[PDB]
């Protein structure tokens, strides 16, 4: 559980950007749930997000770094499908 969020606020230098980033991460962990980068304590993803930020392993850039990379993987398999389909018709 989190009583304060001061450490994360010191990490992400804005009171509001922390809210938005934590929303992004907790949504990821909730729907299509990616496992968190912190040991759980029977918490709700919300607080778990605020756990990850204080450890300094999640922010905008890292999430962007993931998202873009994830997209590439999702694009990469597409080629493997398309070529295979193009092969299978022959």
């Amino acid at each position: 559980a989190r009583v304060t969020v001061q450490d994360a606020v010191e990490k992400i230098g804005n009171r509001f950007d922390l809210v938005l980033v934590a929303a992004r991460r907790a949504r990821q962990m909730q729907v299509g749930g990616k496992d968190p980068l912190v040991p759980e304590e029977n918490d709700k993803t919300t607080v778990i997000a605020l756990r990850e930020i204080e450890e300094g392993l999640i922010n905008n850039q890292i999430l962007d770094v993931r998202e873009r990379q994830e997209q590439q993987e999702q694009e990469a398999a597409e080629l493997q499908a398309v070529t295979a389909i193009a092969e299978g018709r022959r």
Partner: protein
């Protein structure tokens, strides 16, 4: 439909026909026996839509398989019934009808366009007189209204070469004949024809209306309604009530009246009824449309009940019960509840207890979200049943769901943001909401049956926002000033005061304790007393300049209670904070110091531990209160017995005629006041002296452990004014007219008050109660005005780059300083480089935030004036730069980009509005400001200046005393003399204004005659008189134009000249003067020629923000130069101001009864005071500048709070000031397309001038205009915010004719349209959208 703007304009009749799906004809809705909707009525099924969910009225189709088809048994179209609330109809009026709004707005738009008076247009519209149109070859003007007798003349004098219509038909024909653009051009050239400002201003208004109509696609006839659309029926339901009856609907009856009247008119027009009958029917139809649109603007509103007028469309739009403030700005929300709160001391700062029943009834869907996820329930159908069964497993599901889900708690009313907070909930058996003690201060929550509401944040972002912004632990500092909101409660502070207090002789005294822990053991073993004096080895940690704690251990002389409490204080503080008897003041800074050093996380736990310890040791204290504790000093009976006797002596004088009536009263009341002071002092002395104890030998006194004394001294409750009434005497009282009672209430509540004493007390009691009950409304109205004038401002940029600002100095008025420099300048950024006291040495960089350390550094130096950036001066368009605003008072750092400063400032100003009322001193050095003074005969410095101010600077080099000395005062202590406190600095005549000369020389009554200009008075006291100068009002021109003059004369023909001055020593006399130095008298320098004899609380600030003109306007002189008079006082006097160069003939009318600060030759400047009394913020801004008016507003609004003890950060006011003068009036049109003279929004004029000067063309010149809040709120360029505030029936027309368009910028509009606000996280989203664009 996705949208980005809202556009408002007039609706053309064909547009209305485009809106409509049918024409309502039959004024019937439903049968009185069957509930089917009658066709072609107000509830026609085929016009607006079917009533059944997916079935037609005729029943031919009852399936989605036939969706969208049209039946032919009834004609109704089968679709979703919801569409029934969106389709509209239209009624084609048998004759035109004027739109009531546009007829009777604040001006008359229809009247203004035709330049025809509202009375005459109403007379025409209501069929009272003809108006000739297309008069042709007749002596009949363009409009030229004419009565029926006049019309009866034109019927035979002329034939058909003239046309004179009646009613709305004539107005529609006139509008259809309006050559709008040509008329506007002709009028804009006619404007230059005459300089009649009285008509030029309304001509500018008329041409502005014409230009607005020309530019907009609106056409004149659209002001006359021809087709009236009908509201969708589902928005005006005819709901049934208990039994076979339908509830009355207001709009339905108005529509019924209109339809019936119009059908009658159509029937007659078909049957060719006589002209008189058709005219009467048309008038009735027009008045019925009037009742339908804006019922009440008619001569009398119609009603169908006991004089309860029917609500119209315009009634439903505006009003406190209207849509804007009833359903859009504030709407009832699901997932919420309320209950009676109670205090749970066991809760942490971040928790609150809620009942199990309320938790189950609020988190119901979440519980379902587990029942499916747990697999324990099949679906919602069984999940709801299981929840109803309140199964013991469902409580486990609730205990899992509620684990980390915040709940919002808010008490009604919620004046400031601290009234809504997020709490982590915990289940409680009862039905009351468990609230934390330390939080109850923020809510202003007394637990005497106080209800409070809970709201459940549902979505993920809502939970995160609650936990990050609204959590209890995130709001430990008040946003209004640097003051904690977790100030220790009343009970806790009593416990700490009792624990840390020390007694002379006590059990366990004088021993040595090896550490705090052992001390605690001693108390719990009973071997020592809590107040015993002892030596305990203390160890403390001090963090270095880098930030690592340094451990130091020592022996300390202290008390057992303090040593015990030291086990709770965190490892970063000195022992000296706990080595003193803590009270509500002394403890508070302690807590604050923790936040200053350790941080937020140690601070919250330290506060919780302090509360725990305070409660526990206050319970151990058992500090009861009883009648034995209220002490009456024995001398009191004597103090009365003497004091009354003295009044008897004052009575004896009145019994002997030796005193006047008033003097007896004002001596008796003063003697009683002195007696009351003596009684109070004796009572307090007895209260503290009641404790004396033996320290191993001989009695010794000490501080008193009396229950009332400890309650008062700890500051918990019952201050000195309470104990004085409980144990001294109640004292004097006031009548409802405020008169001081000659006979004070010489009793105190411990003793019985008699019948008359209680009846006297009732006056003040009821006055206070009525004051509260009446002021609670004006406070709220002021809050609403502030929020609606400042809702727009948001910190939307980092640095604006400006270098101006405002200079901060300690407030020095009435002698000694009332507030230091540190309070004003803390938390702002420097405007320019801060200089070292002296020369050529700077101390702080030009744009550095002055936090606590730099404030201490400045206070170390002798710096008194510091210029710092202010929100008013920041040059950011449509927003406020972050650097100007500076520190966020609730965080300590600089304010983030995206915070809504406007609402925060408005709440900060308006929260204490319910606390107001609605009913030489030290040695220093003499400094003179604006003091032009001359040497008299004795060489003393006698003032020849009228704006003279006296400033006193102490030995350490800072001004600590300030004074104002009027004109004609003699400066005993001048030329920088050092004078001790209490030694007379200067002297003045407190009654009359004296007039003095500069040179020494002979005089004569130049151009004066006895009787004509002076009265041969006798001075009956002696018989030798000082001549009395005749006034201008007491004498005709033979004495008015013969103005008295006491010009100094000499044999040389001129007086001894001052170097560079040619002015003769000419002096004169005003009215009411008393002059002794007659002809042949030698007047020395500094000799008095003659003498001339002579507020609020909350409203004082409410009218200040509204910028109301004073009842007694102190006239400030303008331009500069030397003043003059014009012609004398007939009706009202006329004067002229002559500058050294420029426009010499500037005149101004002046009131006669207002004495003038200048007579005929006084050097004057812009802003120079000519009369006393309050100034005018408009005039101050126009004459002394934006900084001057801002300083005036800030100081005069802080003088109200300082008197009442309320502290508000000055910045919170400046923002509102920024809103007052957000508009500017153009001085020269220049190369800009702006009108010659017009008020344009300052942001727009500034951006246009910026680009114009970038292109090198003549930028516009403007004067910033100070608008009061009540008007500036309605003057915005976004009509939605203005119409949501007040005068909606006016704004919704003024913007309509202008074809206004809203960009939805601001908070209120976005709240209305249900999208994210442009602040906070919403600002982050909008900023991301704009940057990715």
């Amino acid at each position: 439909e996705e949208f980005d703007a809202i556009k408002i304009a007039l609706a053309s009749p064909d547009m209305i026909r485009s809106w409509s799906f049918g024409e309502v004809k039959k004024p019937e809705t439903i049968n009185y026996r069957t509930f089917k909707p009658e066709r072609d009525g107000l509830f026609c099924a085929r016009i607006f839509g079917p009533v059944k969910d997916y079935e037609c009225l005729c029943g031919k189709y009852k399936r989605l398989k036939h969706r969208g088809v049209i039946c032919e048994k009834c004609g109704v179209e089968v679709t979703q019934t919801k569409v029934r609330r969106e389709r509209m109809g239209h009624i084609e009026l048998a004759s035109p009808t004027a739109h009531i709004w546009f007829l009777k707005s604040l001006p008359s738009r229809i009247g203004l366009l035709l330049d025809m008076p509202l009375r005459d247009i109403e007379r025409v519209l209501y069929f009272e007189s003809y108006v000739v149109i297309e008069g042709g070859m007749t002596n009949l003007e363009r409009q030229q209204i004419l009565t029926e007798e006049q019309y009866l003349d034109a019927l035979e004098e002329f034939g058909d070469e003239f046309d004179a219509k009646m009613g709305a038909e004539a107005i529609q024909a006139l509008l259809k004949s309006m050559d709008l653009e040509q008329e506007c051009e002709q009028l804009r050239e006619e404007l230059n024809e005459t300089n009649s400002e009285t008509k030029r201003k309304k001509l500018t208004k008329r041409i502005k209306l014409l230009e607005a109509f020309v530019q907009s696609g609106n056409k004149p006839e659209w002001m006359i309604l021809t087709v009236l659309p009908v509201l969708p029926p589902d928005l005006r339901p005819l709901v049934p009530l208990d039994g076979g009856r339908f509830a009355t609907s207001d709009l339905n009856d108005l529509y019924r009246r209109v339809i019936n009247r119009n059908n009658r008119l159509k029937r007659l027009l078909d049957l060719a009824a006589p002209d008189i009958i058709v005219r009467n029917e048309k008038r009735m139809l027009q008045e019925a449309v009037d009742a339908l649109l804006d019922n009440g603007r008619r001569g009398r509103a119609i009603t169908g009940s006991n004089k309860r007028p029917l609500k119209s469309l315009a009634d439903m739009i505006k009003g406190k019960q209207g849509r804007f403030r009833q359903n859009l700005l504030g709407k009832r929300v699901d997932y919420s509840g309320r209950s009676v709160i109670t205090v749970g001391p066991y809760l942490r700062l971040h928790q609150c207890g809620l009942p199990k029943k309320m938790a189950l009834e609020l988190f119901k869907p979440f519980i379902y979200g587990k029942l499916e996820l747990r697999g324990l329930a099949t679906t919602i159908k069984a999940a709801k049943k299981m929840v109803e069964r309140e199964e013991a497993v469902v409580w486990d599901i609730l205990d899992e769901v509620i684990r980390e889900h915040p709940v919002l708690l808010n008490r009604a009313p919620t004046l400031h943001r601290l009234g809504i907070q997020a709490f982590e909930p915990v289940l409680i058996e009862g039905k009351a909401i468990q609230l934390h003690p330390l939080v109850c201060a923020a809510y202003n929550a007394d637990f005497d049956g106080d209800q409070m509401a809970v709201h459940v944040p549902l979505t993920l972002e809502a939970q995160l926002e609650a936990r990050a912004l609204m959590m209890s632990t995130n709001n430990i500092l008040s946003p209004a000033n640097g003051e904690p909101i977790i100030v220790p409660s009343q009970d806790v502070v009593l416990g700490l005061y009792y624990m840390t207090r020390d007694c002379v002789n006590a059990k366990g005294e004088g021993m040595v304790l090896t550490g705090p822990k052992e001390a605690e053991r001693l108390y719990r073993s009973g071997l020592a007393s809590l107040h015993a004096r002892v030596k305990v080895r203390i160890t403390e940690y001090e963090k270095d300049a880098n930030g690592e704690l340094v451990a130091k251990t020592s022996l300390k002389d202290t008390t057992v209670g303090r040593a015990i409490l030291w086990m709770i204080v965190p490892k970063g503080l000195p022992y000296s904070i706990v080595n003193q008897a803590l009270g509500k003041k002394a403890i508070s800074k302690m807590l604050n110091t923790c936040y200053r050093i350790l941080g937020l996380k140690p601070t919250v736990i330290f506060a919780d531990q302090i509360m725990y310890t305070g409660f526990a040791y206050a319970a151990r204290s058992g500090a009861s209160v009883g009648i034995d504790d209220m002490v009456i000093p024995e001398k009191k009976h004597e103090i009365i017995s003497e004091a009354e006797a003295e009044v008897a002596e004052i009575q004896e004088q009145f019994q002997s005629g030796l005193v006047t009536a008033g003097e007896r009263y004002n001596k008796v009341i003063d003697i009683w006041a002195a007696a009351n002071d003596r009684v109070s002092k004796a009572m307090m002395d007895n209260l503290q002296t009641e404790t004396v104890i033996n320290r191993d030998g001989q009695e010794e006194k000490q501080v008193s452990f009396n229950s009332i004394y400890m309650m008062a001294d700890s500051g918990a409750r019952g201050s000195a004014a309470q104990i004085r009434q409980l144990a001294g005497m109640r004292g004097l009282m006031a009548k409802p007219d405020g008169s001081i009672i000659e006979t004070p209430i010489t009793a105190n509540f411990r003793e019985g008050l008699n019948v008359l004493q209680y009846f006297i007390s009732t006056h003040g009691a009821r006055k206070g109660l009525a004051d509260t009950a009446l002021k609670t409304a004006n406070s709220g109205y002021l809050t609403r005005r502030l929020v609606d004038v400042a809702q727009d401002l948001v910190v939307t940029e980092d640095d604006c780059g400006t270098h101006e600002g405002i200079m901060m100095t300690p407030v020095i008025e009435g002698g000694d300083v009332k507030e230091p420099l540190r309070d004003r300048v803390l938390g702002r950024v420097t405007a320019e480089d801060v200089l070292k006291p002296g020369t050529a040495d700077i101390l702080v960089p030009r744009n550095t935030l002055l936090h606590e350390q730099w404030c201490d550094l400045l206070e170390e130096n002798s710096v008194d004036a510091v210029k710092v950036r202010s929100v008013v001066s920041c040059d950011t368009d449509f927003g406020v730069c972050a650097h100007c605003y500076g520190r966020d008072l609730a965080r300590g750092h600089i304010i983030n980009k995206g915070e809504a400063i406007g609402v925060i400032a408005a709440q900060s100003i308006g929260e204490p509005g319910t606390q107001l009322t609605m009913r030489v001193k030290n040695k220093g050095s003499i400094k003179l400001s604006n003091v032009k003074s001359v040497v008299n005969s004795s060489g003393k410095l006698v003032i020849t200046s009228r704006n003279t101010e006296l400033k006193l600077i102490d030995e350490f080099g800072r001004t600590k005393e300030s004074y104002k000395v009027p004109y004609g005062a003699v400066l005993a202590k001048g030329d920088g003399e050092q004078v001790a406190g209490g030694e007379t600095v200067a002297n003045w005549d407190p009654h009359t204004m004296p007039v003095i000369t500069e040179v020494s020389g002979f005089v004569r009554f130049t151009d004066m005659i006895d009787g004509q200009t002076i009265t041969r008075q006798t001075d009956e006291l002696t018989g030798l008189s000082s001549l009395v100068v005749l006034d201008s009002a007491e004498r005709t021109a033979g004495g008015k134009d013969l103005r008295p003059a006491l010009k100094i004369v000499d044999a040389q023909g001129n007086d001894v000249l001052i170097p560079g001055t040619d002015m003769p020593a000419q002096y004169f006399l005003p009215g009411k003067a008393i002059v002794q130095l007659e002809d042949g008298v030698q007047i020395s320098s500094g000799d008095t020629l003659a003498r001339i004899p002579q507020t609020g609380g909350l409203p004082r600030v409410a009218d200040l923000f509204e910028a109301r003109r004073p009842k007694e306007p102190a006239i400030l002189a303008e331009i500069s130069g030397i003043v003059s008079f014009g012609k004398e006082t007939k009706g009202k006097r006329r004067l002229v101001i002559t500058p050294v160069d420029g426009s010499d003939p500037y005149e101004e009318m002046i009131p006669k009864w207002r004495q003038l600060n200048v007579f005929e030759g006084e050097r004057v400047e812009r802003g120079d005071v000519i009369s006393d009394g309050p100034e005018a913020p408009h005039d101050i801004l126009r004459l002394r500048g934006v900084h001057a008016v801002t300083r005036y507003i800030v100081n005069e609004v802080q003088d109200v709070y300082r008197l009442q003890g309320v502290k508000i950060n000055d910045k919170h006011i400046e923002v509102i000031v920024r809103q007052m003068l957000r508009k500017a009036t153009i001085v020269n049109a220049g190369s800009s397309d702006f009108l010659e003279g017009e008020q344009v929004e300052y942001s727009r004029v500034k951006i246009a001038n910026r680009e114009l000067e970038a292109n090198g063309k003549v930028g516009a010149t403007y004067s910033r205009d100070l608008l009061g809040i009540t008007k500036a709120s309605l003057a915005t360029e976004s009509f939605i915010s203005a119409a949501s505030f007040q005068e909606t029936t006016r704004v919704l027309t003024e913007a309509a004719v202008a074809g206004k368009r809203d960009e939805l910028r601001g908070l209120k509009e976005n709240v209305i349209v249900g999208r994210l606000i442009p602040a906070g996280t919403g600002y982050a989203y909008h900023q991301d959208r704009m940057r990715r664009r």
